[model samples]
Each structure stands twice: as structure tokens, then as C-alpha cells.
Target: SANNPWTGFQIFLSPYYANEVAAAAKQITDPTLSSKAASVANIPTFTWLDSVAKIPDLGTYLASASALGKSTGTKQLVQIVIYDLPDRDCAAKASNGEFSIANNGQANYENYIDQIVAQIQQFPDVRVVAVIEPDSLANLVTNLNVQKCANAKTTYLASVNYALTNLAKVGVYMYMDAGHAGWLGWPANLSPAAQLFTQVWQNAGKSPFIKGLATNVANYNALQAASPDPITQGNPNYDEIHYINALAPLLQQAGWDATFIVDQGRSGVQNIRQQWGDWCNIKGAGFGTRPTTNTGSQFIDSIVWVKPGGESCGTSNSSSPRYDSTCSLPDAAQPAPEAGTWFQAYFQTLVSAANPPL
Candidate 1:
């Protein structure tokens, strides 16, 4: 077994997360669930990416943020988002694109980038584990072509490099997309379908930017659990470790000393088997690895929650509803009639369930 080291990194919970947890607790009406919600409510969470325009007062922000760092003392990490790319809901044509500045061009993106840079300037003493655009690069790779993909990659790199260049005053360690480890594995297999890890690294390298790679966005666990293994009988587990194993070599091969961070916000329960089908619904998965510190190797840094819990993963009506079958109630409140119906009832269950500290 690979050494599962822990970094005593503190996570910031968004107010949005609090709302979701409260909503979930109300739906469940279980003391156990309520306890879970209360527990998360108590965790020291900072709100960094409240929006592009609003930068929270660092004095108040650091009250929680600094306390988290101080509580852990040594292996501390903070999260910050440097860019908020235009909302192009994956458009093949610029005209159809939701954020196509061609319909505004680069103006909208540039303006957002500018604001993000200004926000970075507000925090000088803080050390942030920057999670730049969550879907920016990965979505493009999965949706667009080589030229278009290159453009997307360049835009993302530009956003980060621009921030680093402008905000050199702040200590921000940035990480670029590795997609989900499941997606980055075997470029020969994934490239035609989507650009591979190597491609993302090389493109990011062009700007000589980015600190590392992040995987398992909105995923339940690490990437290693997602890989096929005889022990798993070809049914891999979709967790953080799986992603670390998949991207470790790719990071080295690309000549980048990129550290890996896995999203552990909601993956408190581990999946029994690996099938992309409806894995999100399974609950009780707690954060993987605890008491994190610099044990030895530099590949795996710390697992953090890029996506907040309680935020519906799309809706319940979609193929994989936000709640999954685990907590989906028969008389559950139906999700609003959107492309992705928000399963309010399911999200409630997740909030209500108890989550152990990892």
C-alpha cells in the first residue's frame, strides 16, 4: 500500500455550504443528521471566492482563516480562487457560448481576470493553496477541439500567470487541472476523447506557470481508487488516492514538481466498487487521511474540498442525480424543473448524516 500521509490543513466552509447543510438537516429531521450539520458548521472555514467583485475583509476573514492555520500550526494551507472564467456552458460555436465575448470576445474574461488580480492584492500575508478555475481547463478539454482546447488552456494559464505576475506580493501556490484522475489516466485512451495530463502540463508549462495539479473535482474520493486493478476485479474505487497514483508519474514525466491535492469535501465514505454510475449518492464517506504533515515524499501534499458539500451535483433527475440512490427519498421534494433538478431532499440527507473528522 502506498504511504497515506496527512497534512494538517484546515478547510474553509462557504456560507453556501452552511445553507445547504441547514436545508439538509431540516429535511432529515434526525438528531444524528443535525449533529453532522452542526459539526460542519463549527469547522473553521474561510470564504475566499465569495465572488469576483466582493473580497471579504481579511481582518474578519483571517479570524477564522488564521485560527485554522494556527490550530494546525505547521502544515497549514489556505484556498483562494484567482480567476472566475466567463460562464461558457461548453459551446462549440462562439455565438452559442454563454460567455463568448465574441458575443462580448475577450472583454468579459479579461475584466473578470482583472478583478481577480485585484482581489489577490488584498491578501498579502496569507498563504493560499490556490484552486484556479475548477471547470475552466478541464471542461474545454472534454468539450472542444485541439485549437479551441489550446485556446482554453492558454486562457486559463494567462489568468494564473497574470495573477502571479500581478500578485507577487501574496504567497499563492497555484494548481491547474488534471481533470479527474479517472479522466487523466492513459492519455492514449483519453486524448481523442479529451486531452490528457501530459497535454495539460505542457500547455501550462508554456507560460512557466502553475504550482501543481488538482484532481477529483466534485468527485467522491481520490484518483487511485478509480484505476482498474485485479484486486478490485476491474471495479476500481473513485477516491483521492486513485488520482494521486495516476497523476504522480505524469507530473514527474512532464518535468514539473507539481504536488497533488484531492477534493475531500464530501468524500467521507468510500465507494465499495468503481462504476461511474450513480456513485455520488453513496454517503458516509469521510475525509481520507488525517493529521497531515510533511511525512517525507513531496508528491501528495494535502486533500482539500474544492467543491463545497450540500451543493447539488447537477440534479436528481439527471442520469446521476445529486443525491444518488443512497439517500433519495420516495416522497422527497422533487428538484426544480431545470436541466438538472436540484434534489433538495437528497442534499438534506447528506447534511444530516454525521461526518467524522479525518
Candidate 2:
């Protein structure tokens, strides 16, 4: 069983991202926006473990936070996104993973988890929270008819179970990624999603380290929409608040009394996205709630910046294999770099349009 890393500590801001934002802030001409940009950099953001190649950076960030903790005499916490699965992001190509089930991806995925476990184990003093595999299980809830998703189902389940089982051993607080309201908030989807999540939880031996749910990773969903968007008209879970309130009880009935964390990283502005599903580096997006535990809902553990702001969701170039049309839609920001690469222009937009004024 793992301890809740959020209990009594200041979440660590990765020096890596802070430095990047500082450099980006220097290029802005508007003094107010520049200062705001610099200030937002100080907000803690999750460090993502999206590929096997990214595993070593985990150790680097952990060492940096652990040293900061020792020097400051305060406990430091680091939140990490555990992504990468066989045929990952089955419904989308832009963020597709390196492994495929056809190529023994299940075994490879287990090894990937082991490497991450090895890295986290090296930083026992650094409190850690992990958001497991974004969009993996949620696809099973709705997209299985897509052959790629259907084929990856068994591996996805096994991979999540494997991650939970091993990460639990190291005592990292775990939140399984649950897609945002637009994806799994429909009434028809809630029960089946709960059943699937419970199946994986049981398979992982019901580890207490497996904490709750993480929603809206790398997507734009208001923490609490004042009013539902036209795109979300009939859905009761139109806003994350409504979604969490709607989904948590069903999960409880299914046996996992889950808490939640919602990402408001790029959701500061509302109704700007043309559709509820438009999520690739959305244009007119602004940084939303800063990472904090002051959420109004008891079911919400915190509002976090899971996606590192300023990173492109995917490249807008149509020629690349990684290109998903979602990144090229009129609603998406243009001239975007490859997925995960820093997009300075977008970062400036996030700063200028920040809801709380950074």
C-alpha cells in the first residue's frame, strides 16, 4: 500500500520546465504577459513518461526534486504521467505509441513499466504520484469497434494491471487515467467504464496504492463550466464537475470508491473549441486552474496541469506518419511542432488568455 503523496507537501515544479518557460517568457514583448508567463512557469506541472526513451529523464527530474527537497527542508512531490501501451491512443494516430501488440508489445510494455519502477525506486524520498496510461481504457469503453482498439484490448488491460501491480509495490500514489467528460461522461458509457476499471483493479490485487481517477489529460475541459457548450448540449457530464459527480458514484457501486484529479491545463477559456472533441493543441485555449487542492468538489483531489503547457499536441504537417487530422482542423492551433515539442506562440496565448490572469 502506498501513502498519498499529496497529503502534506508542496508539489515540485520541474526545473526542466521552469527553465524552458523562463526562456520562452524572455521573448515576449508585453511586459505584463511576459511576467505572467514567468509566473506561470513556477506552477507545478506533471513530467510525462510517454515513451521508453523517456524513462531515464524520470531519474533526472526525481534527483532534481529530491535535492531541492533536501536543501529547502520541505517534502517535495512530483506528478508523472505513465503513458505508452500497445497501439496506444487507438482512436488517434498523432500520439500513437512506439510499441504494437503484433510485435510482442505486451512483454515490451511490462519491461517498460519495470524500467520506470526501477527509476522511481531510486528516489524514495521524493513523493510521487502517477497518472496511468491516458486514453487506453477509455477507448475500450467506446471505440473497440475500431480493429486496432479491439486488437489492443487484452494487452491494454494486462499492461494497466502490470503497471498497477508493480507501481503499487513501490508505494507511488496511482490515478488511472479516465478520459474527459466528452469521452466517457455519457450515461451509457459510465457503467461499462466502471466495470472495465474494476476488472483491472481486481486483477492488480486491489492495491491501495492504486488511488483514483485522472481526467482530461492533455485535453481542454473546464473544471466547472458555468454553462454547457453547444457541443455538449445533452450530456449531463458536460463539465468536469458534472462528470466527476456523475461518474464517481457509479464507480463506488462497482466497488472502487474513486477520488479524482482533473486537468485544466489548457481549459481557461470556454466554448472556444469548435466541438467538444476538438483536443489537439486547441486554438484560443488558455491556462486554467493552477495546480491546487482547493477544488469545490469532495470527489476531486486536485486540479492539475497534467499536460506541460506550450507543448504542441501534434504536428500540423499532414505528411508525417504522426499527423492526425485533428491537429489540422480549423479549431487547432497551426504551425504546431511535433507532438510534445514546445510551441512558444501557443504558450504566449495561454499566458495572455489565462483565466486567473496567470
Candidate 3:
């Protein structure tokens, strides 16, 4: 028998990722759910953005004493988002092009990167996987013009390269943005724009950062791949299979050879409905890919829940719901008697019937 070639299994936990998990646990009402959620949520949240906030002392202590340092256990990686670019006015550009340095320049791009690098340097035994800027590159091309987009790409590449170089001495796997496959396709042309890919490659000195890019961060596969046609069934837009087949050539043509990873945290129960306007209120979707080491292909590293489940898509208030839709009210304030209450209820009913085992 050919050696499985696949390692038995590996798990990575991030204090930062855990912090988001903890925040969601605070909102749950069910006892079973709360308990299960708390186990994972207890992890602390740290960010390069928050300079003065006390370092996650507990997490550091646990990691120091745990198998993480020995590299003989399941946990092997720590992921961080390096997003502190000045022009990263994603919300502003999405809203009305009123771009300004983020957070009144408190966590400016360069400073934030420096902070993250410094923090990682403090942890010698831990391996890091820096998921640099989830949608920064994609959104730039999708929303901005040619000149502005080029500038954003340049700035993004510079920051990513800087971080990669700084973190190299400490052993880190830095992955650049490949925006989900859906974003690269027709009508979007976000990822296909050669300049964006070129800049990312130039900065990383390799095509796409990590072995693969991540898609559907905090989004349902159905939502990310909502299309008018119906020829391709059972395939979510966030599927790496589809993305690789479609963009592999283009990426290679562009002088990049990188694979991809999908955010399957909330996609197990991904909805197929085509309600573009309806924001949150949907539920029951589970892991899009099976939670196992064998992802069926060597090209795929391992499907991970980059974005944990139950995190609020941001309340409906403020124009930004969570992902990208415009909200009329604040995200915290529940709108009226529930804007799409009926739709959600009906959807849940269908889900329960279809997957009674769940």
C-alpha cells in the first residue's frame, strides 16, 4: 500500500480566533450550546491593533506548558490577520468612497504590522499562519478604480512582504488573499484583474501566500456562490475544487502557484435560497467539508473553520450588516418585529426535517 502520505491529524488553536469564539458564547441562550461554546470560546482574543491591551497571558501560559511548544501534538499553527493598511477603507469605499486612515490613524497600517511582528517574536515555540488581510485585495479591485486599486494593491503587497520577512526568522507561513472563487468569476472580475494578482505575488515573492487562499470568511457558501443559473448543483462557490480548476491556469499564467482553503465553519448548513437582500437570521448550516485530516486531495492543506460559527454578522444597525450588505439600523438593535422572521423560521423548519439527526 502506498504510504497514506497524509499525516494522521493536526489541530491548531488561535487565541485571537478563540476570542471571537468567546464573544459569541456570551450571546448564546441554550445551556448545551453555551457549555459546548464556552469550552472553545474561553480562548482569548489578541490583535496587533490593540497595543496596550494586556497580552493573552493565559493563552501564552497554556501554550508554553502545552504540547504546542513540543510540536508533537495536534495543535501546530497560530493564525493572525495583518490588516492595518491606510487605504483599507473597505467600509468607506463600499459605502461612499470617503476613505481615511483607519480608526482615525490610531492603528495605522505600518504600526499595526510592527505590533503583530513584535508579538509573534515573543513566542518562540509556536508556529504561526498569518492570514494576511481577508478581503483587502479583492475589495480593492471590486470597488475601486484602476489607479486607486493599483495603489491599494501596492500598499497591501508592501505590508504583506514586510511582515513575511519579519516573521521568517520565527518560522511563519504567510498566506495572501485569493478572495473566494466567486469573486474571480464573471460580473465580479475582482480576483481576475491581473494587477491585483501580480502585486500579491511580487510582495510575497511567490504566487499566493500560503499553499492556498481562503474563501467565504464569515460567509455562507450559498451566499458567496449565489448565482442565477442552476447547472452546477451541490457545489458551493467556496469550493476549492472549482476555484482551483478555474483559476489555476490563470494563476500559473500570472507566475503564481498556490492552492486554496475555504472557511467551512458556518457552511455545513449553507442555504441555497437566492434572497440577496436578507442579512442574518439563517441558521443550522454545519461544516461544509468533513472535519477530518484527509481532505481527499494533497493540494488542499486542511479545511479549517477560519471564522467560527455564531459570531454576529454584526447587528443590522449601521449600513454594514457584517459581511457586505448595507444596513439601515445599528447591528445590535434588532430591527422592528424581525425583518425576515418568517423566512428564517420556514428555513429552519426545512432544515430540521431534512437533517433530523442533527
Most accurate candidate by TM-score: 2
Worst 10 residues of 3 by lDDT: 336-345
Q: Tell how far residue 99 is off in model 3, in angstroms.
A: 11
Residues 1-358 of candidate 2: C-alpha lDDT, one tens digit per residue: 1233576887888776888899999999989889989987789899888899888888888888888889999888888999989888888865558888889999999999999899889989987899999989999999999888898889899999999999999888899999988899887788888888888888998887777899989888887877888888778888888888888897778677678888988888888887888888899999998888878787888888999889888999999888998899999989898988889999999999998777
lDDT of 1 at 289: 32
lDDT of 3 by residue, 127-204 (tens): 565556665666666756655455565555565566555555555565555555455543236345545665656665
Give me the displacement of residue 87 in model 1, in angstroms.
4.8
How many pairs of residues collide in model 2? 0
Error of 2 at 8 (Å): 0.8
- Candidates sorted by TM-score, best first: 2, 3, 1
Candidate 2 has its poorest 10 consecutive residues by lDDT at 1-10
The 0-to-1 C-alpha lDDT of every candidate, in the order given, reads 0.47, 0.87, 0.46
- In model 3, the runs with Cα more than 4 Å from the true position are 1-10, 14-75, 89-107, 146-154, 187-195, 207-210, 222-240, 272-293, 318-358
Question: Which 10 successive residues of model 1 have the least lDDT summed?
Answer: 89-98
RMSD of 3: 6.9
Runs in model 2 deviating more than 4 A are 1-4
lDDT score, residue 72, model 3?
66
